Amino acid sequence: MTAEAGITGTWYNQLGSTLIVTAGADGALTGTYESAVGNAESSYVLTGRYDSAPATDGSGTALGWTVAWKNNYRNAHSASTWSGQYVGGAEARINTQVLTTSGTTEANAWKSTLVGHDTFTKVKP
């Protein structure tokens, strides 16, 4: 029932976006993020961390990851970070909150960062 085993694979958000992630035995998250819209276009590299020895008292597993919105096809001069927890079981979820910062002048820094939320499931919407 390990968090390593549970997190590794493909997840889909409410908006249709696809997360493909491998959770390493010692806390690494690596993979890609594709489709719908943070500020997207094809696949982007994703990296993060998770608690590889979580509590076994029914608590979720803390994690986070980052995508910089630059690949071979697009550069949005922005990066998003998702912070959340994985909940296992038949109805598994990654529940997140997400910050998206765009590069700005000092003057526009006040409007540099968006906040949203993303819920990921194992099955498509």
Side-chain angles (χ1 to χ4, degrees):
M1 206 196 119
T2 75
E4 186 186 2
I7 292 162
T8 294
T10 305
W11 298 84
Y12 303 98
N13 82 343
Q14 68 261 48
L15 299 156
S17 284
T18 307
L19 159 67
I20 303 165
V21 59
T22 297
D26 279 296
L29 295 178
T30 55
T32 61
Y33 169 111
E34 50 202 66
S35 4
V37 92
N39 2 35
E41 157 138 65
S42 186
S43 139
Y44 298 82
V45 175
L46 111 35
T47 191
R49 306 285 299 164
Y50 78 108
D51 176 5
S52 50
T56 55
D57 62 351
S59 294
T61 299
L63 51 64
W65 65 86
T66 302
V67 173
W69 299 109
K70 172 197 189 280
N71 65 16
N72 284 5
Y73 311 96
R74 192 177 164 18
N75 192 349
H77 302 308
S78 63
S80 296
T81 64
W82 286 255
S83 176
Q85 60 186 311
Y86 160 77
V87 179
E91 63 325 291
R93 304 268 180 288
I94 308 176
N95 298 138
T96 70
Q97 283 179 279
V98 48
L99 301 182
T100 300
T101 300
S102 299
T104 68
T105 63
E106 170 200 296
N108 294 331
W110 71 272
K111 57 180 179 170
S112 68
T113 307
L114 294 164
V115 59
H117 51 89
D118 248 333
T119 306
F120 294 96
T121 56
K122 295 258 79 202
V123 202
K124 278 203 194 173

